Amino acid sequence: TLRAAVFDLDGVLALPAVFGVLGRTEEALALPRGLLNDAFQKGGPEGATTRLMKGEITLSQWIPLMEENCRKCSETAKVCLPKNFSIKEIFDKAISARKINRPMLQAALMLRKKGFTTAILTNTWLDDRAERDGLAQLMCELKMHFDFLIESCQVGMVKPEPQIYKFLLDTLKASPSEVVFLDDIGANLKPARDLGMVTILVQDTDTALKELEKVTGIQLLNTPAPLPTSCNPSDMSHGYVTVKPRVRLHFVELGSGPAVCLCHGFPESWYSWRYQIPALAQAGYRVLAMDMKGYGESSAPPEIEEYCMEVLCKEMVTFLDKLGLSQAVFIGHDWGGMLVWYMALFYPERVRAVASLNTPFIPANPNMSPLESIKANPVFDYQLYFQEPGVAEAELEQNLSRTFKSLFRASDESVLSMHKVCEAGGLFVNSPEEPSLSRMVTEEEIQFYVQQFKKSGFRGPLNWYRNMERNWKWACKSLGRKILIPALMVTAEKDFVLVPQMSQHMEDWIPHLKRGHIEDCGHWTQMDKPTEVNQILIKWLDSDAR
Amino acid sequence: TLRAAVFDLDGVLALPAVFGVLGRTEEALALPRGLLNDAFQKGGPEGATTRLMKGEITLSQWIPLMEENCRKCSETAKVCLPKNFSIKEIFDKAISARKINRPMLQAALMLRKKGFTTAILTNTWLDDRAERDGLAQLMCELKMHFDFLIESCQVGMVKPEPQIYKFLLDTLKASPSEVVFLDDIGANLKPARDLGMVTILVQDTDTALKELEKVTGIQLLNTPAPLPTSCNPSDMSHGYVTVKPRVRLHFVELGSGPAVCLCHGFPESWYSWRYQIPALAQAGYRVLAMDMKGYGESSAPPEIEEYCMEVLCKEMVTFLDKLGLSQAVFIGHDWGGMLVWYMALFYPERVRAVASLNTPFIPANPNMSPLESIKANPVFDYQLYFQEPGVAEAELEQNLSRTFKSLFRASDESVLSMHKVCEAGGLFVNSPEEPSLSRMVTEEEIQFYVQQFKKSGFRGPLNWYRNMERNWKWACKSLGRKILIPALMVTAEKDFVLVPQMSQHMEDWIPHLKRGHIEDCGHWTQMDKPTEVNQILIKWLDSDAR
Ligand SMILES: C[C@H]1C[C@@H](CO)C[C@@H](CN)C1
Ligand SMILES: C[C@H]1C[C@@H](CO)C[C@@H](CN)C1
């Protein structure tokens, strides 16, 4: 009975294979056939390549030794290599061209999801080339999805030596019968099979995956599009900045490149960006996923005025100041989306670009009190219910698991009637005591929000809605301004509170505004349509925010 | 009696003045004299410039309005502006050219050090230009050194209106008699003087500073070279990464750009880099100042083996993995310097560049046990005293304040006889019970190390010295390798343990090695010679690690 899957890197998890380029280069340069491949193989277990693969020497020390035995191979073959000929150039290009074999990684992901222990077992080198970062990034993206990465150059052992195989079984804590091993080299497959391991010779991916699924009894080929990589809270770098004596801001941080500050809505968490964090980091950005004031590990002072837009925005400017960031791209959703437009209007020098999910930018009406405006829209009734301090806190804090289970639902799953929330007496009066689990969230994901909300409750979050008049007066100071920095408005088709229609006049105040639209998407945009969100944000970031 | 100093930005804390360019441009373009300056001034309190300065409109909305009144000014003057003429270009160049007036900032720093409340009061705009980041960075570097920054466009008030002055006194919580106000505009100086404020008209800096010192009674001109900006621990972004179930790593983080990982020595802290952190961040780098395993807010497991180089290096690789960093520049001192060379030998793909302060790279002698090698050097006797678990912990933990006061001393201040530490019975047997305070450290800085060491003590730190044999066996696997990535070796003239001479054969293993040398510098390199350290590291970073 299988419980572990092992994959080679070259020709298996990454394609095209690097050694296959030795053949390509000799065919392109009309050199004798295997000439370059024999030079690579020179000395076998005692040669330069084995010393390199065992970690005795680095790739840059190996380059001239490959060059010396490239001559020796051509000397006997009674030929001569050209004047342009460079091993460095050949390997630089080969390594750069080699990309992740996505269906192979997906199969490894599905196996790990079904309970398998997964590992990468590879014959590799210590890369000290000036271009080494390319491979560093690939190994980083790859390794994250596996329980173990075993590198020949780190363990001082090599395939096909039988010691690396015994090292593999020892690392896996499993007998050879419990293990599937995939390799593109028959010679490297042989010792694994010799111990009684299920072995797959990998030529084309599809056949290898058909063999993989037949042997494991798990569908790996033609399976539905998987969800983007999520975040395990305990595997993140957690950051904390004191913005004022009584206020500390918490954030999760991942990646390098331009700073991208993610701002969640009500009643959320940094975790609402779980599907965007690895994606944006992988796209070449430094992600800072906030716990907005009043939430999770961030401070939650009780005073209403502490949550007015002016104070919240000033604190986000201090947050940048204390981190030593002159700018950040600001991406917000719901209440975070509103803050993000206000950061753009009042602090354009600190905002590299601005993006909003669902939240439109609507200039304040100076000839109408905000309470009249909220009253004018039937869907905004819940906001009037949120005004009296203590009432909504009592209902929302009563049963946390029920609160998030009731709120976090797809467009085709609602249990919440937004109509006449005040007259009905509350948000969940028509909702079951034990709501069913939404298709968007696991029981584990609900419990993270439950645990987060046990710290400070709903007072701070609800206070974001309790500064309508203060926010309106502040917003009126910006009535003569336009948003002229790069901006993106993302609308969600089925958000019945933050309707796409509400964003239709935005080009009057943001003339160069770019857009994104998500069909069959409810209010909880990031978890509802994670793949589409990431596609829209990455495309916009690479074009307008770099 | 004065207790507050207020400075203008343009023509005072930053030079050359931006409006002075209106004159330069008309003189260069042979336009009528004041033509461009009158266009800027058009409408006075009701004009576009006042609307801009009060924050009613943004700089990009203002540009075409300045252009319209540039014509109106030339219409009456019976002239015509050329076809190349661009206000955007003129202001882009003017803002870019404007740099911090260093002696003015130094005077403000000295005043704040002597107990003054300091503030920047400026007539500025909301910058939404594509080039806005340049000014964002300048404001960021400037603001940090002041108690308050008052911007006309944020407060909706402007100089010379008397309301901004009353707002200033209210912000300062001081009467006009307690305040010095510096401005390059006589008209803007007038209302401050009208309230009874000491006023300085700023033309040339030196005269303004002579006036400043006469009026405050504090020497500001011709004063010694100040120390680089330090770190206040409570104003930093604190980061935490779990590298394995029982191990969490703490770090301080500042800036944007390539990641620079700072690794302290024994018995230190992230705080040992206090003078490098703001400097390196200001030079365009993302600084990550570690609490190395066993120190401060990082985990300190008791087991000796947890502190062998192999484990420590693997954990630093996991640290990069969890932060989403494919590489970092590694800069180490003392034990951190040793780790940093091992990161380069075993993980060259993860190290962008490597720099060491004091610690040389010496390949392991495979024909000599490490205990024989340590015995062969009289200065390394203290290391043999550190071998027996508990002994050095008892002496070092006995009185923490005495420990750091005894250790952290300049070359001309030693109280510690490194000769025969074992035979003498300990490190401090010849040391006073109440050592004098070194010129390198304040009493406050000693107490931070004292507070840090109260958490875990000296067991984990001393364990770094307790893996000689384990480290030697691991190092022998790298005996055939060379360090071929960018590298810097910084020697300290007066380090009597890590002597410059010990680094003389490094070019044999690191052929492209770059060097730095610090004269009259002891073991505590970073705090002993902070200015020189920063100069050497910044120059090397900008040339080899970018
Ligand atoms: C009570 C919730 C309902 C939610 C839409 O289901 C929107 C959210 C934030 N505006 C408030
Ligand atoms: C006991 C201290 C003395 C110090 C030099 O004063 C060096 C340090 C780390 N090698 C150990």
Nearest Cβ partner of A57 from B143, B352, B480?
B480
Q: Which two tokens stand for residue A226?
A: 């998987």
Look at residues A421, A397, A414 and name the one whose alpha carbon lies nearest to residue A528.
A414
B63 vs chain A: nearest CA distance in angstroms? 13
Looking at the complex, does the CB of residue B508 fall below 8 Å from at least one CB of chain A? no
DSSP state of A10: B
* Residue B412 appears among annotated catalytic residues: no
Do residues A252 and A236 lie in contact, with contact meaning Cβ atoms separated by under 8 Å? yes
Rounded Cα distance between B16 and B101, Å, is 9
What is the structure's resolution, reported in angstroms to one decimal?
2.2
Do residues B125 and B62 lie in contact, with contact meaning Cβ atoms separated by under 8 Å? yes
Rounded Cα distance between B181 and B155, Å, is 19
Domains B1-16+97-217 and B17-96 share a fold: no
B448 lines ligand 2 (CB under 6 A): no
Helix (H, G, I), strand (E, B), or coil: what is residue A239?
strand
A334 lines ligand 1 (CB under 6 A): yes
Helix (H, G, I), strand (E, B), or coil: what is residue A226?
coil
Amino acid letter at A355?
Answer: A
Nearest Cβ partner of A484 from B60, B136, B352?
B60
Instruction: Please give the distance, rounded to the nearest whole angstrom, from the Cα atom of residue B528 to the centre of ligand 2.
Output: 14
B523 lines ligand 2 (CB under 6 A): yes
From residue B179, give the alpha-carbon distance in Å to each of B2, B193, B197, B439.
6, 10, 6, 33
Best probe of the B interface among A124, A244, A256, A310, by most B CBs < 10 A, is: A256
> Would you put residue B323 in left (φ > 0), alpha (ψ -120 to 50) or beta?
alpha
* Residue B523 appears among annotated catalytic residues: yes
Packing angle, helices B87-97 and B20-28, rounded to 10:
120
Q: Which CATH class is domain B17-96?
A: mainly alpha
Do residues B117 and B174 lie in contact, with contact meaning Cβ atoms separated by under 8 Å? yes
Do residues A122 and A151 lie in contact, with contact meaning Cβ atoms separated by under 8 Å? yes
Contact: B350, A56; criterion CB under 8 Å:
no
Helix (H, G, I), strand (E, B), or coil: what is residue A449?
helix
Residues 217-236 of B with CB under 8 A from A: 234-236
Contact: B480, A259; criterion CB under 8 Å:
no
Q: Which of B291, B334, B528, B544 is catalytic?
A: B334
CB < 8 Å to A55, chain B? 477
Look at residues A478, A78, A441, A30 and name the one whose alpha carbon lies nearest to residue A272.
A441
Contact: B281, A324; criterion CB under 8 Å:
yes
B127 lines ligand 2 (CB under 6 A): no
Residues 153-172 of B with CB under 8 A from A: 154, 156
> Would you put residue A57 in left (φ > 0), alpha (ψ -120 to 50) or beta?
beta
CB < 8 Å to A483, chain B? 128
Quick one: how far is CA B319 from the chain centroid? 23
Residue with tokens 């003429």, as numbered in its chain: B85
Rounded Cα distance between B2 and B12, Å, is 20
Ligand 1, atom 11: closest residue by C-alpha:
A266
Beta strands in A14-96 (DSSP E): 14-15
Beta partners for residue B10, in sequence order: B14
Do residues B119 and B168 lie in contact, with contact meaning Cβ atoms separated by under 8 Å? yes
Ligand 1 atom closest to the CA of A409, numbered from 1: 6
Rounded Cα distance between A85 and A74, Å, is 13
Residue with tokens 């390949």, as numbered in its chain: B363
Instruction: Please give the distance, rounded to the nearest whole angstrom, from the Cα atom of residue A207 to the centre of ligand 1.
Output: 48
Amino acid letter at A431?
Answer: S
Nearest Cβ partner of B349 from A132, A321, A350?
A132
Q: Which of B295, B342, B523, B528 is catalytic?
A: B523
**Phi, psi dihedral angles at B456 (to 5 degrees):** -125, -10
Do residues A359 and A453 lie in contact, with contact meaning Cβ atoms separated by under 8 Å? no
From residue B96, give the alpha-carbon distance in Å to each of A71, A324, B93, B145, B148.
56, 20, 5, 21, 24
Looking at the complex, does the CB of residue A253 fall below 8 Å from at least one CB of chain B? yes
Nearest Cβ partner of B349 from A135, A143, A258?
A135
Helix (H, G, I), strand (E, B), or coil: what is residue A211?
helix
Domain layout of chain A by residue ranges: 1-16+97-217, 17-96, 236-546
Beta partners for residue A251, in sequence order: A239, A290
Contacts of B80 (CB under 8 A, 6+ apart): B74
Contacts of A252 (CB under 8 A, 6+ apart): A231, A233, A236, A237, A238, A239, A270, A277, A287, A288, A289
Rounded Cα distance between B14 and A258, Å, is 27
Do residues B228 and B278 lie in contact, with contact meaning Cβ atoms separated by under 8 Å? yes
Q: Which two tokens stand for residue A545?
A: 């925010």
* Residue B465 appears among annotated catalytic residues: yes
- Number of Cβ within 10 Å of residue A85's Cβ equals 16
Helix (H, G, I), strand (E, B), or coil: what is residue B100?
strand
Residue B442, Cβ density class (10 Å: 0-12 exposed, 13-18 middle, ≥19 buried)? exposed
CB < 8 Å to B133, chain A? 326-327, 349, 352
CB < 8 Å to A484, chain B? 58, 60-61, 128
Q: What is the DSSP string of A117-170?
A: EEEEEE------STTTHHHHHHHHHHHTTSSEEEEHHHHT--TTSHHHHHHHHH
A10 is an annotated ligand-binding site residue: yes
B10 is an annotated ligand-binding site residue: yes
Look at residues A508, A509, A517 and name the one whose alpha carbon lies nearest to residue A539.
A517
Residues 271-330 of B with CB under 8 A from A: 278, 281, 286-287, 321-327
In terms of CATH, what superfamily is B1-16+97-217? HAD superfamily/HAD-like (3.40.50.1000)
B293 lines ligand 2 (CB under 6 A): no
B530 lines ligand 2 (CB under 6 A): no
Experimental determination technique: X-ray
Residue with tokens 């430094």, as numbered in its chain: A286
A49 is an annotated ligand-binding site residue: no
Helices (H), B10-120: 20-28, 35-41, 48-53, 59-76, 87-97, 102-113
The CATH fold assigned to A236-546 is: Rossmann fold (3.40.50)
Do residues A488 and A356 lie in contact, with contact meaning Cβ atoms separated by under 8 Å? yes
DSSP state of B135: H
- Nearest 5°: the CA angle A174, A180, A182 is 130
Instruction: Please give the distance, rounded to the nearest whole angstrom, from the Cα atom of residue A266 to the centre of ligand 1.
Output: 7
First to last CA, chain A: 50
Cβ–Cβ pairs < 8 A, chains A and B: 159
Q: What is the DSSP string of B298-347?
A: S---S-GGGGSHHHHHHHHHHHHHHHT-S-EEEEEETHHHHHHHHHHHH-
Rounded Cα distance between B190 and B201, Å, is 10
Q: Which two tokens stand for residue A535?
A: 């596609």
Residue B541, Cβ density class (10 Å: 0-12 exposed, 13-18 middle, ≥19 buried)? buried
Looking at the complex, does the CB of residue B476 fall below 8 Å from at least one CB of chain A? no
B123 is an annotated ligand-binding site residue: yes
A479 vs chain B: nearest CA distance in angstroms? 8
Q: What is the DSSP string of A315-374?
A: HHHHHHHHHT-S-EEEEEETHHHHHHHHHHHH-GGGEEEEEEES-------TTS-HHHHH
From residue A420, give the alpha-carbon distance in Å to each of A343, A389, B190, B479.
33, 19, 60, 77
DSSP state of A201: E
Looking at the complex, does the CB of residue B139 fall below 8 Å from at least one CB of chain A? yes
Looking at the complex, does the CB of residue A149 fall below 8 Å from at least one CB of chain B? no
Q: What is the DSSP string of B65-93?
A: HHHHHHHHHHHHTT----SS--HHHHHHH
Rounded Cα distance between B88 and B85, Å, is 9
Do residues B218 and B241 lie in contact, with contact meaning Cβ atoms separated by under 8 Å? no
Rounded Cα distance between A71 and A522, Å, is 65
